[PDB]
Design brief:
Chain E: It is found in: Cell membrane; Cell projection, Dendrite; Cell projection, Axon; Cytoplasmic vesicle. The complex is a heteropentamer of chains A (53), B (338), C (227), D (229) and E (276). Chain A has 53 residues and is an all-alpha fold. Chain A contains two helices and no strands. Chain B has 338 residues and is mainly β. With 229 residues, chain D is mainly beta. Helices cover 0% and strands 46% of the residues of chain D. In chain D, strands 12, 14, 15, 16, 19, 20 and 21 form a seven-stranded mixed sheet that branches. In chain D, strands 3, 4, 5, 8, 9 and 10 form a six-stranded antiparallel sheet that branches. Chain D has a four-stranded antiparallel sheet with strand order 1-2-7-6, with no helix packed on it. Classes of the chains: A mainly alpha (53), B mainly beta (338), C alpha/beta (227), D mainly beta (229), E mainly alpha (276). Chains in contact: A-B, B-C, B-D, C-D, C-E. The interface between A and B is large, with 37 and 58 residues. Bound molecules: the ligand CCN(CC)C(=O)N[C@H]1C=C2c3cccc4[nH]cc(c34)C[C@H]2N(C)C1. The ligand CCN(CC)C(=O)N[C@H]1C=C2c3cccc4[nH]cc(c34)C[C@H]2N(C)C1 binds next to helix 4, helix 8 and helix 10 of chain E.
């Protein structure tokens, strides 16, 4: 059947992809949160004067 | 011969399982153990919006961070000013059953769809001082579940026919069709660059697609039931999903594997909506128990609860500035929290 | 400390509210129903009194007013209809082969978690076809259903004059199986109203008005604290 | 969009008359409506306002007690009844349409006008500035009280009347530019001091320019400045 | 002794307060029907706190006035107003139930949450008018409300006309409504629908009998006294009336529990607050 030979090609496409170790990916997400911490209003409550609500 | 091809398919799946095991050097939990905890987060209702006479299904925030749109099964769509709680416009809809709504980045247009199987575009700014339908898009053979606008002349839609599409509004026709799911598609999220998107379906799987070439780059698995919600992390290298099995999970694009699961023994109900804060430290979810829980994304510990509804929470949103969160319910009301 | 243009915007918002309230009052004057069937049912021809994603019909009896919806374009979309007055389910009585499939579908709707407080009206169509198959004797219900042979029509049961004893035993046998599922699950919350119909029958619309009058009365006894 | 006005002529002093305006091409019911007059060789002065729904009516002190304003939403008409007329009433009267909501542009369209023959102070000192094609010019307006509000909005408007025709909106709320207007025009200022800058001046920019305030009623206008080649 | 009267005062204040708390601390009970019940509760709690304690002091003091001599009219005025209101609420609850049962579809179309306010205004307005003449024509002449320190009514024309308007006309409407409501449910019988109808008939009957047994005995003997001159019987007649008025007050404690307990939701809420 055509369907089976189309599924085979898709599975082969996803196999030949470069992947990186879990430590690097987790270490990158932790870094982003530390850098943008002071610019999140929800994490630390803003003074009443600054609040628009 | 058909059976022989089926064996070849399994062999490729076996190779894929081995490669992702090799890249499992450590766990997110062991890297983040030293980090200090967020604290306890307490929020209060600052505004209540009243006007809809039936359950609300969807909502969307404008890029300005002051104007929002809501859709209800009373056949009406309303635009609101959050600061003064005033109603700018009210639009009558031809079909009562609507399941989705969207706001254009320019602010000149809005879109809605549902069981009619059509997506309709409305022109907010025109002479004559009225809002009028500009185009109606037809071609899907199943109900419309979600819709988002890339630009003034580009929109992406999801359906219950197991397919997704990209459209040209002026011509009224589909430039590309994305196919490969075996179950109804319930949600869609667009990346910040706008070059890629992710979709979630009732087959319990999520797929990543390239908008220009109409192909599926990668497929993700792990949930035990239908996925109803999907969101993208602010960097663009990771995403989060919610399902009716009562758990939420986080996946990484470059590693190709799940990093963490957020769950508790007390919670047994399904998850309807998901969102992230501007820094990405906090994950917000909506449940069928009428309550919303706040989670620390890095350490998987519950930090707070925001319950203000007497019926199921159906929608959630966070502003681009990051100042406030909005929630919608089957009780006919919308609330703003800070 | 307030702007002239701000006061004018507030006046526009109040006018929008008055229009929304008036539209809501129009809705409480109308009753909504959902039609479900399996395609051999003959569901479209049920209401002869009056007349791709969704189809609609409108009819009126004794000044009360009614609207019906069929989504022939089910697990995910059935959530939307949790506030309808009632659900109408149609089955073909004459087809022995497809009877078990129909029974399984009814059980799923009765036991769904979003439809716990909604009552169901059951229509058993093609009752003329059932009579000729029973009298002819070529096809036996016993082959499909083993317990039929050890069955006796209820002692106090009364049939319409002229109907043969054999038809009365068979008609009563098929009605009993559906009522069994209704008694087994939800209690003190919902009832099934069962009727036998033919294509020529023209009294279907009156029967629906009568069943709705029972549904509203039972809720009022609950609201006033009497029951 | 069209507004046409009729009912005008010579009247003896102590008389009465009614003026009418007919609207087409737009939703008349959703828009608030106003009246304004220009004396034979003078400048614009406001007369009265009626809100959508007929809820709010406001009047100038000079015409109060002798003039009334009404609207007929089904027949799309607006009227002014005038009684006990005096010589000062001679002028040309215009109908203007306005809508109020977040982000709206008020005073967008004006009618041609009909002729009858029988407080914050805004100052624009220059009465005439000579100009040449291809050059940049600046016009300035001053106010008695600050137009900035705690909401963060400054209410000042700019208009142009080219020879032989009605006034047209150029800028609203200090910096915003009206639809269908060229990008050469720009507006800047501070509470109590304001400037409008035109670059690459071309023919068709010749006319009289006016500044108006919408902070409070009564609405007031400056005298006007004329650019001539 | 007199302490037995005290049990009635403690019970009325406590029971009525719990009913107000339930509507306030639950949202399933926020219908228009439950709002009329809260208005009835306010009247019974007030009578208990104000008029009912003053009555007891009269027992110990022998009917003499420990309180100042000129304030007797205020006490008489409050009792007529609070008691008339409770009787008027019960008649309206009876006539609303009949329309629900006889015509179920029309009642559902026109219940708007605006119709509850219109009913509450009418019940209070009728009461103020009947109560108002006392401090107007009687107050000016102090002697009318005083009998050698009695602090008792002396008018023989207000008692006759007032009793008929306040109690006898409301009683007649309640009797005719009851016969019609019971007959309507019976015809439907002539399935679960039948058992629910049989349970409802029994509940309606208990409520009707309580009103006749409690209020009728004080009112009938008061009217008989005015008509009689030499069939008066002297001291015993006066004594019987004093005992009967306390029995009528007890209805105020019973009314909150009877109109709410048959619903399961109310019983659960009362339990949690009592445990707290
Ligand atoms: C204040 C206590 N005193 C003074 C000893 C009373 O004599 N009170 C009694 C008279 C009453 C009466 C008389 C006429 C018409 C009426 N309509 C409603 C009522 C009423 C209330 C009723 N109260 C319950 C008992």
């Amino acid at each position: 059947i055509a369907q089976a030979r189309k599924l085979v090609e898709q599975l082969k496409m996803e196999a030949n992809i470069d992947r990186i170790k879990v430590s690097k990916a987790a270490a990158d997400l932790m870094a982003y949160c530390e850098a943008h911490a002071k610019e999140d209003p929800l994490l630390t409550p803003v003074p009443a004067s600054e609040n628009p609500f | 011969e058909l059976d022989q091809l089926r064996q070849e398919a399994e062999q490729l799946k076996n190779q894929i399982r081995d490669a992702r095991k090799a890249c499992a050097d450590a766990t997110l939990s062991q890297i983040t153990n030293n980090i200090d905890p967020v604290g306890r987060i307490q929020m209060r209702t600052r505004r209540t919006l009243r006007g809809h006479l039936a359950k609300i299904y969807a909502m969307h925030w404008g890029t300005d961070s002051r104007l929002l749109v809501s859709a209800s099964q009373d056949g009406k769509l309303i635009i609101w000013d959050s600061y003064t709680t005033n109603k700018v416009h009210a639009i009558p809809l031809r079909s009562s059953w609507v399941m989705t709504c969207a706001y254009a980045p320019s602010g000149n247009y809005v879109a809605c769809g549902g069981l009619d199987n059509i997506c309709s575009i409305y022109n907010l700014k025109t002479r004559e001082g009225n809002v009028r339908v500009s185009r109606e898009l037809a071609g899907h053979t199943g109900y419309l579940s979600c819709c988002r606008f890339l630009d003034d002349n580009q929109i992406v839609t999801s359906s219950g026919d197991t397919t997704c599409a990209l459209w040209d509004i002026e011509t009224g026709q589909q430039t590309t069709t994305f196919t490969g799911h075996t179950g109804d598609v319930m949600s869609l999220s667009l990346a910040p660059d706008t070059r890629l998107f992710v979709s979630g379906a009732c087959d319990a799987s999520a797929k990543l697609w390239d908008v220009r070439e109409g192909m599926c780059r990668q497929t993700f698995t792990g949930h035990e039931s239908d996925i109803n919600a999907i969101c993208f992390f602010p960097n663009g290298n990771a995403f989060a999903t919610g399902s009716d099995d009562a758990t939420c999970r986080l996946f990484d694009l470059r590693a190709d594997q799940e990093l963490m699961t957020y769950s508790h023994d007390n919670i047994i109900c399904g998850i309807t909506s998901v969102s992230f804060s501007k820094s990405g430290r906090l994950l917000l979810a909506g449940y069928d128990d009428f309550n919303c829980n706040v989670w620390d994304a890095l350490k998987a510990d519950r930090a707070g609860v925001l319950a203000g509804h007497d019926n199921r929470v159906s929608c959630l949103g966070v502003t681009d500035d990051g100042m406030a969160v909005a929630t919608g319910s089957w009780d006919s009301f919308l609330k703003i929290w800070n | 400390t307030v702007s002239a243009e701000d006061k004018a915007a507030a006046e526009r918002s109040k006018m929008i509210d008055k229009n929304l309230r008036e539209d809501g009052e129009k809705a409480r004057r109308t009753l909504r129903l959902l039609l479900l069937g399996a395609d051999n049912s003959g569901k479209s021809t049920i209401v002869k009194q009056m007349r791709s994603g969704i189809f609609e019909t409108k009819f009126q009896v004794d000044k009360v007013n009614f609207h019906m919806f069929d989504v022939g374009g089910r697990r995910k979309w059935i959530q939307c209809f949790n506030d309808v007055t009632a659900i109408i389910f149609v089955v073909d009585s004459s087809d022995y082969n497809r009877l078990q499939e129909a029974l399984n579908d009814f059980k799923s709707i009765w036991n769904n978690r979003w439809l716990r407080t909604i009552s169901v009206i059951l229509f058993l169509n093609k009752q003329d076809l059932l009579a000729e198959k029973v009298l002819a004797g070529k096809s036996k219900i016993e082959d499909y259903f083993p317990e039929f042979a050890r069955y006796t029509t209820p002692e106090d049961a009364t049939p319409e004059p002229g109907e043969d004893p054999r038809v009365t035993r068979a008609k009563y046998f098929i009605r009993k199986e559906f009522v069994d599922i209704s008694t087994a699950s939800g209690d003190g919350r919902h009832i099934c109203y069962p009727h036998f119909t033919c294509a020529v029958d023209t009294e279907n619309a009156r029967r629906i008005f009568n069943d709705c009058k029972d549904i509203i009365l039972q809720m009022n006894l609950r609201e006033y604290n009497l029951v | 969009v069209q507004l046409v006005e009729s009912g005008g002529g010579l009247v003896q002093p102590g008389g009465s008359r009614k003026l009418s305006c007919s609207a087409s091409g737009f939703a008349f019911s959703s828009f608030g409506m106003h009246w304004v007059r220009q004396a034979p060789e003078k400048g614009l002065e406001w007369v009265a306002y009626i809100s959508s729904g007929s809820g709010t009516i406001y009047y100038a002190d000079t015409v109060k007690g002798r003039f009334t304003i009404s609207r007929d939403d089904p027949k799309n008409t607006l009227f002014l009844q005038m009684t006990s007329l005096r010589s000062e009433d001679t002028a040309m009267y215009y109908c203007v349409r306005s809508i109020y909501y977040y982000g709206s542009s008020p005073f967008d369209f004006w009618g041609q006008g009909t002729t009858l023959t029988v407080d914050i102070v805004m100052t624009q000192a220059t009465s005439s500035v000579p100009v040449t094609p291809g050059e940049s010019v600046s016009i300035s307006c001053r106010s008695s009280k600050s137009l900035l509000h705690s909401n963060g909005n400054t209410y000042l408007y700019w208009f142009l009347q080219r020879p032989g025709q009605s006034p047209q909106l150029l800028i609203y709320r200090m910096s915003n530019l009206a639809s269908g207007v060229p990008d050469r025009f720009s507006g800047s200022g501070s509470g109590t001091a304001f400037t409008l800058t035109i670059s690459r001046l071309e023919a068709e920019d010749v006319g009289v320019y006016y500044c108006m305030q919408h902070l409070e009623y009564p609405l007031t206008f400056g005298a006007g400045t004329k650019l001539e080649l | 002794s007199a302490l037995l009267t005290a049990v009635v005062i403690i019970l009325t204040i406590a029971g009525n307060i719990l009913v107000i708390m339930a509507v306030s601390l639950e949202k399933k009970l926020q219908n228009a029907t439950n709002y009329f019940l809260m208005s009835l509760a306010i009247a019974d709690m007030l009578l208990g706190f104000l008029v009912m304690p003053v009555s007891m002091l009269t027992i110990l003091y022998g009917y003499r006035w420990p309180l100042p001599s000129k304030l007797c009219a205020v006490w008489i005025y409050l009792d007529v107003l609070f008691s008339t209101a409770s009787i008027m609420h019960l008649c309206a609850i009876s006539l609303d139930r009949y329309v629900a049962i006889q015509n179920p579809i029309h009642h559902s179309r026109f219940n708007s949450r605006t119709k509850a306010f219109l009913k509450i205004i009418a019940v209070w307005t009728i009461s103020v008018g009947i109560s108002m003449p006392i401090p107007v024509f009687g107050l000016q002449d102090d002697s009318k409300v005083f009998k050698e320190g009695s602090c008792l009514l002396a008018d023989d024309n207000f008692v006759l006309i007032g009793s008929f308007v306040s109690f006898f006309i409301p009683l007649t409407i309640m009797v005719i409504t009851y016969f019609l409501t019971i007959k309507s449910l019976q015809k439907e019988a002539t399935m679960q629908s039948i058992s629910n109808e049989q349970k409802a008939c029994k509940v309606l009957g208990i409520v009707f009998f309580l009103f006749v047994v409690m209020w009728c005995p004080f009112f009938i003997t008061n009217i008989m006294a005015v008509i009689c001159k030499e069939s008066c019987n002297e001291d015993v007649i006066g004594a019987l009336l004093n005992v009967f008025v306390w029995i009528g007050y007890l209805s105020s404690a019973v009314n909150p529990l009877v109109y709410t307990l048959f619903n399961k939701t109310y019983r659960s809420a009362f339990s949690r607050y009592i445990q707290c």
